[PDB]
Every structure is written in C-alpha cells, then in structure tokens.
Amino acid sequence: EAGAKSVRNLPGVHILAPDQLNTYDVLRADDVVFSVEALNAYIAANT
Amino acid sequence: TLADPRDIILAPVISEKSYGLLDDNVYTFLVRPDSNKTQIKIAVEKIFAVKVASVNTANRQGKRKRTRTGYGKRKSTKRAIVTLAPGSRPIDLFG
Amino acid sequence: VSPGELRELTDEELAERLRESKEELFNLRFQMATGQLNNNRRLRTVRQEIARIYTVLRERELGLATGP
Amino acid sequence: AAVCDICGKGPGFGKSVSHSHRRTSRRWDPNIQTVHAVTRPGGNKKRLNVCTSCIKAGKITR
RNA sequence: GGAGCUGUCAACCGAGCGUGGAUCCGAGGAUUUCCGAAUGGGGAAACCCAGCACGAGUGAUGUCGUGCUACCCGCAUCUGAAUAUAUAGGGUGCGGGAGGGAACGCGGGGAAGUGAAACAUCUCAGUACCCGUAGGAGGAGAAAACAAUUGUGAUUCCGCAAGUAGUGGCGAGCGAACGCGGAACAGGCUAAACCGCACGCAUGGGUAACCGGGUAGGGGUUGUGUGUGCGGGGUUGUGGGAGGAUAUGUCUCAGCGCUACCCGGCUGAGAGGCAGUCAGAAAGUGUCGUGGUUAGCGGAAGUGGCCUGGGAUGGUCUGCCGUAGACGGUGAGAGCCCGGUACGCGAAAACCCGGCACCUGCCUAGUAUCAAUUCCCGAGUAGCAGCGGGCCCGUGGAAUCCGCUGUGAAUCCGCCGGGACCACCCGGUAAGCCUAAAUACUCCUCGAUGACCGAUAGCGGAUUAGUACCGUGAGGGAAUGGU
Ligand SMILES: [Mg+2]
Ligand SMILES: [Mg+2]
Ligand SMILES: [Mg+2]
Ligand SMILES: [Mg+2]
Ligand SMILES: [Mg+2]
Ligand SMILES: [Mg+2]
Ligand SMILES: [Mg+2]
Ligand SMILES: [Mg+2]
Ligand SMILES: [Mg+2]
Ligand SMILES: [Mg+2]
Ligand SMILES: [Mg+2]
Ligand SMILES: [Mg+2]
Ligand SMILES: [Mg+2]
Ligand SMILES: [Mg+2]
Ligand SMILES: [Mg+2]
Ligand SMILES: [Mg+2]
Ligand SMILES: [Mg+2]
Ligand SMILES: [Mg+2]
Ligand SMILES: [Mg+2]
Ligand SMILES: [Mg+2]
Ligand SMILES: [Mg+2]
Ligand SMILES: [Mg+2]
Ligand SMILES: [Mg+2]
Ligand SMILES: [Mg+2]
Ligand SMILES: [Mg+2]
Ligand SMILES: [Mg+2]
Ligand SMILES: [Mg+2]
Ligand SMILES: [Mg+2]
Ligand SMILES: [Mg+2]
Ligand SMILES: [Mg+2]
Ligand SMILES: [Mg+2]
Ligand SMILES: [Mg+2]
Ligand SMILES: [Mg+2]
Ligand SMILES: [Mg+2]
Ligand SMILES: [Mg+2]
Ligand SMILES: [Zn+2]
C-alpha cells in the first residue's frame, strides 16, 4: 500500500491486483507494469 | 403560574367611532376572545382603579383578503365597550 | 436582564418582578395602538424577560438549582 | 350458540359436496347445550353455554 | 462555532442587537390554549355546561387560577341482597388496556371477471378483499423423523432433483418427495411414581401405631388413608426413572426430629467453586474505556508573461503540488481562486455497546454393581366410525396431517409410523412449555451510484399540490420553470 497510494491520482494510471487481471484493462493500456512480487504470483497461479 | 388582570385587556380601539364615545366616558378595548363580561369588569376595576357600570361585548369575524397564493382569513377579535359609573374618574389611555 | 442576576432574587421578589414587568408590557401595548412608540424592539425585550422569570420560578419547584 | 364458554371451541368451516360435486360453504357448529351450573354445592346457579364434550367430562357440576 | 445578524414567497422600510461571543449547528430541560383513542357530562371535531378539593378576588352573590372525577380487565382488601351458609352486586386503593403506522409475519373468513373456443366439475386462487393479532423480524424447532438391510441424526432458507414421478370433464391444466451441494448451527426446562411440610375431609382409641433407623426405656390418642398447594427427587429410547439389596462416601459451626447411645437426615450461618442480563431466574447502583452515534475543524501547490475577449477557467510558452486529477461553485473546459477532496484530529452532556466491581442466583451428597416382584412415563387424548378440509393425489385400493359430531383404550410383554391391510423385522417414544443464527420488508435517517428522466418527459405534484376546481358524499383531480 506504499506504492498503491503513490500512483492513484496520476491521470492514465490504472491500478489492479494480480488476481484481477482482465481483458478490458490490459487492452486499454499501452504499457503493463508488473511488480516483481506480482508477476511471480501470476505465473505461479497459472503454472 | 399566577394570573394577572392585564392579560385579558390587549389594546384600545382607535377609530372615529371610539373617539366619539370618549366624551361620554365610554371606552373600547380589544379583549382576549375567551373572556366574559365579568372578567372584563373585575379587570378594569383593578387596572385603572375606577368603578364600572356596564360592559358590552361584540364578537367580530375576520376579513378574508384575496392574495395571489390564495384566500387568507384574518384574525377574529372581541371588542368590549366599557361604560363607567355616573361620576367617576376618567381613564387616561395615553392619547 | 441577564439570567445570572435573576437568581439572587429570593422567592417573592421574583413574584413582584414578574408583576412589575407585566405592567411594563401593558403600557407598551397601549403605546403601539396609539402610535406613540418609536422603539418597537422593546415589545420583544419585555416578553423575553417575563418568559425568563417564569423559567426561574419553575426550576425552584422542580428541584433544579434551588436557592434564595 | 356456537362458542363454548369453557374450552373456547368454535365452529369449523368446510364445504358441502353434492352429487355433481358442486361445493358450497357451510359450518360445522358444535353441540352447544345450555346448563345452569354452580360453583360450590347449594350455591346460586348461572346460565352457561357449554358443549357436550365438556359435560361428558367433569368440567361442570349442577 | 467565530463576525456579522433580525427565516422564506419578496421586496420596500421601520427600529435595534453583536468580540463582555449575537444570528447559526447539536444534545438535554422547562412551557406546551383547543380538538383528536378523547376519557368529568354533552356536541354539528376544534364548541357548550359542570361537580369536588385547595388558593386568588368582591361589601356579598357574580368571576378566576392549579389539580382530580369515563368505561372495562387484573390483583389486594371491606361489606354480603332476595336468604340461612353464601354468592351476584356495591365502596376504597394500587397497576394495565383502548388509538395510529408504508411494507413484511402467523391464525381464521374468502369472490368474480378470465381459461376451458360454450359450461356445471376443475381453473383463475387460497389470489383480491376481510377479521383477529403481533415482532424487530415472525412462524418453525430438539424426532410417535426419514431411510431400507451398510446409514443420516432439531428447525428455517437458497440451488438441484423436475416441469420428472404422478395427478387431471386423464380436458384446460396442476405438480411433489426421497436424496445430493450449500448458508447457519444449540440446545434447555417441566408433568407422573415416590419422599418431606402446611391446610381441609373421613376413620380409630390400647384396635393400634408413631415419636429419623438400629439399641434401652418413656410419652400414653395424633396415628392411618385421601384431597388441594409449596419444596426435594425425575427427564429417557442402547429403554429410562422411582422402589429394593450389597459394598463405598460426607468442609466447619449452631439449631432441630421424647431421652440416652451408634448412625443418618433436615434448617441457618460461614468457607470454597461456578454462572449472570441469557432460551437455561432477575432487577439495580457505581466506576473505567485506543471504543460507537448526535455539532465540527485543520488540510499541499501560480496576484506568471503574451494573444483573443465584456469576462480566462480558452489558446500558447513557463513555474509547482499530489496519501489531494472526487464533485461543485466562481463573469466560458480550474489539482494550484473558493466550499472542499486524500489523510488525520474533536465530545460538556445524553444515548448505545463492552469490561471490572457492587449486587443477584445456583451447587457442596451422592456414586458404583446386582436383583427383575411391584409402581410411573402428559385422557374425554389416541384409535374406530359418519361428514368435510388439505396433501402430486378431483373419494379412489387411500396411508400421513387437520376440523366438528358420536363411541371410546392401554404405561413398555405398552403404544405410533414405515401409502389399503395382516405377519415379521427396522425406526421413534404423541396427547406440556421455551429457544439465538441463516431468511422477509423500508413510511423514515445518513452516504454514494446510473450507456435513468430533463418541463406534453420524470412522482399526480420542479410552480398556492393532494392546492385551485368538480361531487351531497365516498371519491375524482389539474395547468403554470429559464432577463
Ligand atoms: Mg401559562
Ligand atoms: Mg346595557
Ligand atoms: Mg351580545
Ligand atoms: Mg376585497
Ligand atoms: Mg359469546
Ligand atoms: Mg376452508
Ligand atoms: Mg367455483
Ligand atoms: Mg369428540
Ligand atoms: Mg439553539
Ligand atoms: Mg430542543
Ligand atoms: Mg370531552
Ligand atoms: Mg362522549
Ligand atoms: Mg347472607
Ligand atoms: Mg395495536
Ligand atoms: Mg366460474
Ligand atoms: Mg362466468
Ligand atoms: Mg370460456
Ligand atoms: Mg372466447
Ligand atoms: Mg419465535
Ligand atoms: Mg442438507
Ligand atoms: Mg411437585
Ligand atoms: Mg474549513
Ligand atoms: Mg484549500
Ligand atoms: Mg467551470
Ligand atoms: Mg471540476
Ligand atoms: Mg380433499
Ligand atoms: Mg409398507
Ligand atoms: Mg410420552
Ligand atoms: Mg416431551
Ligand atoms: Mg414455539
Ligand atoms: Mg429467526
Ligand atoms: Mg437519500
Ligand atoms: Mg409534470
Ligand atoms: Mg422546451
Ligand atoms: Mg364542495
Ligand atoms: Zn367445551
């Protein structure tokens, strides 16, 4: 929650959780930034 | 909670009929509309220190006046016309 | 008249401050009818101080802040 | 009457079925019989409306 | 709370108040005419007239102010008519009820139009409407349960089973349950046998018992049986309980059951353990919370240049904030001008929730084995029959469940259910009561949302709106926003 609060009110930055990835939010964004704790927790859930 | 004879008598009537009765020592008061002639006679003999011969009362309905938000009825009064004793002190109603 | 200065009056000075303040309203109701009252804010003032005296006399027979 | 003054038993409502199976409303009223009951022996009587199932038991005396 | 204010259609004025804290916001208190369940008696609701007690006023009747006085039910007392026991009724003092509310709940009453291409059975539909009566939810509920040879183990609710089994002038249509997956979990008191004590009825006087049992006497009639109450004992399905028999066992003191002794029980206090606002008993006084609600306040960063214009929030170059780029206002698209937002601070008093005391209550004698003779396990009930209601089941071979009428059992070697019924086997112990949670609803209070409406739309109602107007009445019911 230290970095979640840091990028709330930037225009264009949308924040979601690893278990809340969905097609409408990936395709709206030109760039997808994973936290390294969040990218491993997405790969280890889909093997 | 105690009473007062000045709670019955509200105000005097100021009109060119009531000025014509001041010459004969006859006074016109607006009284509270739930008061009989004996309350009014005990009160005038205790407020002004005078002797009262007779009290004549007259209810009057309120006027109803046209207004753009509808009709509206005014307040309903009770006059009481007080005749003093033959030869007592006149009441100074301050004008 | 402040409420703080009506509380040192004992038990029957309030009954004769109530009595000489209903005469003050009575003389002011005659001056409004005859049109000889310039200060018309004094009708509102005397009605409040009659109302303020009944509050002090009622508290003393309800057991709230008694004392001469 | 149709209401017992001890057990509170009232009428039940049902139907009345004909041969063409047409159904109309009627009442099963209870067998209410009047009694002049006493409380203590030799006492004064009192008119009550009781049913026959409470005279068959010992709910009242006479 | 912090400098203006005396609400608003809706101004024009008049006269005043405020840094000695006003107006305004919140909490508690006082006042609270008259009608209305309306309740002193009356009435055409908002009016009319009193009685009694205590005060005020008058020379004295007049007059006045504050209290109290309906009816019914319940409890506690006094009186006890015809009439004797007595009751009905009456007097007195305490408590309670009545009426209203948008939906939701439970019990009871109960249509029709319509569908059947007509219609009567059936449907619509146990719907509309109606009556009784609640609670913050209610009802239900601790197996007379299902199941079928292994088993599940209170109820309610949602999804399946399933538009299936079936049921139907086998027409139109209607329609389960077994069982499986979940939400949520909780279990507790009484009646009876018998044992003490209190009151009433009947019987008995050395017939006899009883005086806690045994052991000696004494007393010399308060026993024996039964009825109504209050305690103890008892709460079960693998049947349990009372009553026996044998071992085993009792925290202190006082009192008590004719006297002594051995033993045991009862009452009161103390000590110790437990439980508590609860379904399992119930009220209250204190004190303390990192607590909650009913006002609030603080809160970062541009007077930036030039162009356009009445106006910059616009364009165009620049400077910053962001745990704040939600929304709105401001002379046109504003994070940086304002009210605020993110994020933190704030409660005298009242109320709610919780903790600790105070207080209140329960427990401190039984436990274990054997015996299987007796006693008990909820009565005008179950069952049976007659007529009906409802179950998928429309009277059918019709079980289970419920109503009225009639007949009318048994206490465990009992009784009820397992879809007529019988035998066997399995399952459970009806005719007493209470029980949180999951579920249903929003007149009303705060806080957000909309590929919702934007004045013939959205509520009938942005405007005198249930207003004007129409109707005797119940009811009907508009139109009108923008400098
Ligand atoms: Mg008053
Ligand atoms: Mg005359
Ligand atoms: Mg007249
Ligand atoms: Mg005119
Ligand atoms: Mg009757
Ligand atoms: Mg019926
Ligand atoms: Mg029909
Ligand atoms: Mg019967
Ligand atoms: Mg205030
Ligand atoms: Mg207030
Ligand atoms: Mg009345
Ligand atoms: Mg009446
Ligand atoms: Mg008698
Ligand atoms: Mg009610
Ligand atoms: Mg029909
Ligand atoms: Mg028809
Ligand atoms: Mg038809
Ligand atoms: Mg047709
Ligand atoms: Mg309940
Ligand atoms: Mg289940
Ligand atoms: Mg008992
Ligand atoms: Mg502020
Ligand atoms: Mg600011
Ligand atoms: Mg704007
Ligand atoms: Mg904005
Ligand atoms: Mg049937
Ligand atoms: Mg069978
Ligand atoms: Mg039983
Ligand atoms: Mg039972
Ligand atoms: Mg119940
Ligand atoms: Mg519930
Ligand atoms: Mg709202
Ligand atoms: Mg409209
Ligand atoms: Mg338009
Ligand atoms: Mg009319
Ligand atoms: Zn009966």
JSON list of C-alpha atoms (C1' of nucleotides) in Angstrom, two decimals, chain E residues 334-459:
[
{"chain": "E", "resi": 334, "resn": "A", "atom": "C1'", "xyz": [-9.70, 25.10, -12.90]},
{"chain": "E", "resi": 335, "resn": "G", "atom": "C1'", "xyz": [-5.45, 19.79, -8.77]},
{"chain": "E", "resi": 336, "resn": "C", "atom": "C1'", "xyz": [-2.60, 25.16, -7.75]},
{"chain": "E", "resi": 337, "resn": "C", "atom": "C1'", "xyz": [-9.21, 31.35, -6.82]},
{"chain": "E", "resi": 338, "resn": "C", "atom": "C1'", "xyz": [-13.33, 29.31, -3.29]},
{"chain": "E", "resi": 339, "resn": "G", "atom": "C1'", "xyz": [-16.53, 25.30, -0.38]},
{"chain": "E", "resi": 340, "resn": "G", "atom": "C1'", "xyz": [-13.95, 21.10, -0.04]},
{"chain": "E", "resi": 341, "resn": "U", "atom": "C1'", "xyz": [-11.34, 16.04, -1.51]},
{"chain": "E", "resi": 342, "resn": "A", "atom": "C1'", "xyz": [-6.80, 12.41, 0.24]},
{"chain": "E", "resi": 343, "resn": "C", "atom": "C1'", "xyz": [-5.34, 11.92, 5.07]},
{"chain": "E", "resi": 344, "resn": "G", "atom": "C1'", "xyz": [-5.69, 12.90, 10.10]},
{"chain": "E", "resi": 345, "resn": "C", "atom": "C1'", "xyz": [-7.64, 15.44, 14.78]},
{"chain": "E", "resi": 346, "resn": "G", "atom": "C1'", "xyz": [-12.62, 16.51, 18.03]},
{"chain": "E", "resi": 347, "resn": "A", "atom": "C1'", "xyz": [-17.47, 15.25, 22.52]},
{"chain": "E", "resi": 348, "resn": "A", "atom": "C1'", "xyz": [-19.55, 19.01, 28.43]},
{"chain": "E", "resi": 349, "resn": "A", "atom": "C1'", "xyz": [-23.93, 16.18, 28.37]},
{"chain": "E", "resi": 350, "resn": "A", "atom": "C1'", "xyz": [-27.43, 12.42, 26.54]},
{"chain": "E", "resi": 351, "resn": "C", "atom": "C1'", "xyz": [-27.90, 7.54, 24.34]},
{"chain": "E", "resi": 352, "resn": "C", "atom": "C1'", "xyz": [-26.00, 2.74, 22.72]},
{"chain": "E", "resi": 353, "resn": "C", "atom": "C1'", "xyz": [-22.12, -1.42, 23.06]},
{"chain": "E", "resi": 354, "resn": "G", "atom": "C1'", "xyz": [-18.44, -3.79, 26.02]},
{"chain": "E", "resi": 355, "resn": "G", "atom": "C1'", "xyz": [-15.01, -4.59, 30.54]},
{"chain": "E", "resi": 356, "resn": "C", "atom": "C1'", "xyz": [-14.43, -4.65, 36.30]},
{"chain": "E", "resi": 357, "resn": "A", "atom": "C1'", "xyz": [-16.77, -4.37, 40.85]},
{"chain": "E", "resi": 358, "resn": "C", "atom": "C1'", "xyz": [-21.20, -3.91, 43.71]},
{"chain": "E", "resi": 359, "resn": "C", "atom": "C1'", "xyz": [-25.30, -6.91, 43.61]},
{"chain": "E", "resi": 360, "resn": "U", "atom": "C1'", "xyz": [-28.33, -11.44, 42.43]},
{"chain": "E", "resi": 361, "resn": "G", "atom": "C1'", "xyz": [-28.76, -16.80, 41.95]},
{"chain": "E", "resi": 362, "resn": "C", "atom": "C1'", "xyz": [-27.39, -21.97, 41.66]},
{"chain": "E", "resi": 363, "resn": "C", "atom": "C1'", "xyz": [-24.20, -26.30, 43.64]},
{"chain": "E", "resi": 364, "resn": "U", "atom": "C1'", "xyz": [-21.39, -28.74, 48.08]},
{"chain": "E", "resi": 365, "resn": "A", "atom": "C1'", "xyz": [-24.22, -35.52, 48.75]},
{"chain": "E", "resi": 366, "resn": "G", "atom": "C1'", "xyz": [-24.04, -38.97, 46.42]},
{"chain": "E", "resi": 367, "resn": "U", "atom": "C1'", "xyz": [-21.59, -42.71, 43.36]},
{"chain": "E", "resi": 368, "resn": "A", "atom": "C1'", "xyz": [-20.91, -47.94, 41.64]},
{"chain": "E", "resi": 369, "resn": "U", "atom": "C1'", "xyz": [-22.69, -53.16, 40.98]},
{"chain": "E", "resi": 370, "resn": "C", "atom": "C1'", "xyz": [-26.59, -56.76, 41.35]},
{"chain": "E", "resi": 371, "resn": "A", "atom": "C1'", "xyz": [-31.75, -58.28, 41.58]},
{"chain": "E", "resi": 372, "resn": "A", "atom": "C1'", "xyz": [-36.20, -58.11, 37.95]},
{"chain": "E", "resi": 373, "resn": "U", "atom": "C1'", "xyz": [-41.71, -58.93, 42.10]},
{"chain": "E", "resi": 374, "resn": "U", "atom": "C1'", "xyz": [-44.31, -54.15, 42.29]},
{"chain": "E", "resi": 375, "resn": "C", "atom": "C1'", "xyz": [-45.11, -48.56, 40.70]},
{"chain": "E", "resi": 376, "resn": "C", "atom": "C1'", "xyz": [-44.71, -44.39, 36.79]},
{"chain": "E", "resi": 377, "resn": "C", "atom": "C1'", "xyz": [-43.55, -42.46, 31.88]},
{"chain": "E", "resi": 378, "resn": "G", "atom": "C1'", "xyz": [-48.57, -35.98, 29.90]},
{"chain": "E", "resi": 379, "resn": "A", "atom": "C1'", "xyz": [-57.06, -38.59, 28.71]},
{"chain": "E", "resi": 380, "resn": "G", "atom": "C1'", "xyz": [-62.70, -37.48, 27.02]},
{"chain": "E", "resi": 381, "resn": "U", "atom": "C1'", "xyz": [-56.45, -37.65, 24.21]},
{"chain": "E", "resi": 382, "resn": "A", "atom": "C1'", "xyz": [-55.05, -41.70, 20.68]},
{"chain": "E", "resi": 383, "resn": "G", "atom": "C1'", "xyz": [-57.85, -45.20, 17.93]},
{"chain": "E", "resi": 384, "resn": "C", "atom": "C1'", "xyz": [-62.63, -46.63, 15.35]},
{"chain": "E", "resi": 385, "resn": "A", "atom": "C1'", "xyz": [-66.89, -44.75, 12.66]},
{"chain": "E", "resi": 386, "resn": "G", "atom": "C1'", "xyz": [-70.07, -40.51, 9.93]},
{"chain": "E", "resi": 387, "resn": "C", "atom": "C1'", "xyz": [-69.45, -35.94, 7.13]},
{"chain": "E", "resi": 388, "resn": "G", "atom": "C1'", "xyz": [-65.71, -32.36, 5.26]},
{"chain": "E", "resi": 389, "resn": "G", "atom": "C1'", "xyz": [-60.68, -29.61, 4.53]},
{"chain": "E", "resi": 390, "resn": "G", "atom": "C1'", "xyz": [-55.71, -30.21, 2.61]},
{"chain": "E", "resi": 391, "resn": "C", "atom": "C1'", "xyz": [-51.75, -33.25, 0.77]},
{"chain": "E", "resi": 392, "resn": "C", "atom": "C1'", "xyz": [-48.93, -34.61, -6.88]},
{"chain": "E", "resi": 393, "resn": "C", "atom": "C1'", "xyz": [-53.36, -37.49, -5.23]},
{"chain": "E", "resi": 394, "resn": "G", "atom": "C1'", "xyz": [-60.56, -34.08, -8.11]},
{"chain": "E", "resi": 395, "resn": "U", "atom": "C1'", "xyz": [-63.31, -40.36, -2.92]},
{"chain": "E", "resi": 396, "resn": "G", "atom": "C1'", "xyz": [-60.32, -43.51, -5.23]},
{"chain": "E", "resi": 397, "resn": "G", "atom": "C1'", "xyz": [-57.49, -49.74, -3.07]},
{"chain": "E", "resi": 398, "resn": "A", "atom": "C1'", "xyz": [-56.28, -44.05, 0.08]},
{"chain": "E", "resi": 399, "resn": "A", "atom": "C1'", "xyz": [-51.88, -44.28, 4.18]},
{"chain": "E", "resi": 400, "resn": "U", "atom": "C1'", "xyz": [-49.70, -39.44, 6.77]},
{"chain": "E", "resi": 401, "resn": "C", "atom": "C1'", "xyz": [-51.91, -34.36, 8.62]},
{"chain": "E", "resi": 402, "resn": "C", "atom": "C1'", "xyz": [-56.27, -31.09, 10.46]},
{"chain": "E", "resi": 403, "resn": "G", "atom": "C1'", "xyz": [-61.83, -29.64, 11.91]},
{"chain": "E", "resi": 404, "resn": "C", "atom": "C1'", "xyz": [-66.96, -30.66, 14.04]},
{"chain": "E", "resi": 405, "resn": "U", "atom": "C1'", "xyz": [-70.29, -34.99, 15.89]},
{"chain": "E", "resi": 406, "resn": "G", "atom": "C1'", "xyz": [-70.66, -39.90, 18.17]},
{"chain": "E", "resi": 407, "resn": "U", "atom": "C1'", "xyz": [-68.35, -44.17, 20.51]},
{"chain": "E", "resi": 408, "resn": "G", "atom": "C1'", "xyz": [-64.06, -44.66, 23.41]},
{"chain": "E", "resi": 409, "resn": "A", "atom": "C1'", "xyz": [-58.36, -47.76, 25.17]},
{"chain": "E", "resi": 410, "resn": "A", "atom": "C1'", "xyz": [-53.63, -49.23, 27.14]},
{"chain": "E", "resi": 411, "resn": "U", "atom": "C1'", "xyz": [-47.98, -47.50, 30.59]},
{"chain": "E", "resi": 412, "resn": "C", "atom": "C1'", "xyz": [-43.13, -50.90, 27.99]},
{"chain": "E", "resi": 413, "resn": "C", "atom": "C1'", "xyz": [-44.78, -58.45, 27.38]},
{"chain": "E", "resi": 414, "resn": "G", "atom": "C1'", "xyz": [-47.01, -50.65, 26.08]},
{"chain": "E", "resi": 415, "resn": "C", "atom": "C1'", "xyz": [-48.45, -47.56, 22.09]},
{"chain": "E", "resi": 416, "resn": "C", "atom": "C1'", "xyz": [-47.41, -44.83, 16.87]},
{"chain": "E", "resi": 417, "resn": "G", "atom": "C1'", "xyz": [-45.21, -44.58, 11.96]},
{"chain": "E", "resi": 418, "resn": "G", "atom": "C1'", "xyz": [-42.69, -47.28, 7.53]},
{"chain": "E", "resi": 419, "resn": "G", "atom": "C1'", "xyz": [-49.10, -45.31, 1.24]},
{"chain": "E", "resi": 420, "resn": "A", "atom": "C1'", "xyz": [-55.29, -50.19, 1.94]},
{"chain": "E", "resi": 421, "resn": "C", "atom": "C1'", "xyz": [-54.48, -54.48, 5.41]},
{"chain": "E", "resi": 422, "resn": "C", "atom": "C1'", "xyz": [-52.06, -58.69, 8.09]},
{"chain": "E", "resi": 423, "resn": "A", "atom": "C1'", "xyz": [-47.45, -61.31, 9.99]},
{"chain": "E", "resi": 424, "resn": "C", "atom": "C1'", "xyz": [-42.14, -60.48, 10.65]},
{"chain": "E", "resi": 425, "resn": "C", "atom": "C1'", "xyz": [-38.19, -57.04, 11.00]},
{"chain": "E", "resi": 426, "resn": "C", "atom": "C1'", "xyz": [-36.40, -51.89, 11.38]},
{"chain": "E", "resi": 427, "resn": "G", "atom": "C1'", "xyz": [-37.21, -46.84, 13.35]},
{"chain": "E", "resi": 428, "resn": "G", "atom": "C1'", "xyz": [-39.33, -43.43, 17.12]},
{"chain": "E", "resi": 429, "resn": "U", "atom": "C1'", "xyz": [-41.40, -42.56, 22.14]},
{"chain": "E", "resi": 430, "resn": "A", "atom": "C1'", "xyz": [-47.69, -38.32, 20.76]},
{"chain": "E", "resi": 431, "resn": "A", "atom": "C1'", "xyz": [-51.58, -36.14, 23.78]},
{"chain": "E", "resi": 432, "resn": "G", "atom": "C1'", "xyz": [-46.84, -29.84, 28.49]},
{"chain": "E", "resi": 433, "resn": "C", "atom": "C1'", "xyz": [-43.66, -25.24, 27.53]},
{"chain": "E", "resi": 434, "resn": "C", "atom": "C1'", "xyz": [-39.35, -22.08, 25.85]},
{"chain": "E", "resi": 435, "resn": "U", "atom": "C1'", "xyz": [-35.24, -21.37, 22.13]},
{"chain": "E", "resi": 436, "resn": "A", "atom": "C1'", "xyz": [-30.37, -17.21, 19.12]},
{"chain": "E", "resi": 437, "resn": "A", "atom": "C1'", "xyz": [-28.24, -17.56, 13.73]},
{"chain": "E", "resi": 438, "resn": "A", "atom": "C1'", "xyz": [-29.08, -18.26, 8.27]},
{"chain": "E", "resi": 439, "resn": "U", "atom": "C1'", "xyz": [-34.50, -15.81, 5.75]},
{"chain": "E", "resi": 440, "resn": "A", "atom": "C1'", "xyz": [-38.61, -11.43, 4.52]},
{"chain": "E", "resi": 441, "resn": "C", "atom": "C1'", "xyz": [-39.55, -5.86, 4.42]},
{"chain": "E", "resi": 442, "resn": "U", "atom": "C1'", "xyz": [-38.29, 0.16, 4.11]},
{"chain": "E", "resi": 443, "resn": "C", "atom": "C1'", "xyz": [-43.12, 5.16, 5.97]},
{"chain": "E", "resi": 444, "resn": "C", "atom": "C1'", "xyz": [-38.31, 7.02, 7.86]},
{"chain": "E", "resi": 445, "resn": "U", "atom": "C1'", "xyz": [-32.09, 8.68, 8.80]},
{"chain": "E", "resi": 446, "resn": "C", "atom": "C1'", "xyz": [-27.31, 9.42, 6.80]},
{"chain": "E", "resi": 447, "resn": "G", "atom": "C1'", "xyz": [-23.59, 8.23, 2.44]},
{"chain": "E", "resi": 448, "resn": "A", "atom": "C1'", "xyz": [-22.58, 7.05, -2.69]},
{"chain": "E", "resi": 449, "resn": "U", "atom": "C1'", "xyz": [-24.24, 5.30, -7.94]},
{"chain": "E", "resi": 450, "resn": "G", "atom": "C1'", "xyz": [-26.82, 5.48, -13.14]},
{"chain": "E", "resi": 451, "resn": "A", "atom": "C1'", "xyz": [-24.94, 3.60, -21.73]},
{"chain": "E", "resi": 452, "resn": "C", "atom": "C1'", "xyz": [-32.09, 6.86, -15.75]},
{"chain": "E", "resi": 453, "resn": "C", "atom": "C1'", "xyz": [-35.88, 11.41, -16.86]},
{"chain": "E", "resi": 454, "resn": "G", "atom": "C1'", "xyz": [-34.76, 16.99, -18.33]},
{"chain": "E", "resi": 455, "resn": "A", "atom": "C1'", "xyz": [-40.86, 20.74, -18.00]},
{"chain": "E", "resi": 456, "resn": "U", "atom": "C1'", "xyz": [-46.78, 17.16, -23.18]},
{"chain": "E", "resi": 457, "resn": "A", "atom": "C1'", "xyz": [-40.78, 13.61, -20.07]},
{"chain": "E", "resi": 458, "resn": "G", "atom": "C1'", "xyz": [-39.54, 12.10, -14.51]},
{"chain": "E", "resi": 459, "resn": "C", "atom": "C1'", "xyz": [-43.92, 11.05, -8.94]}
]
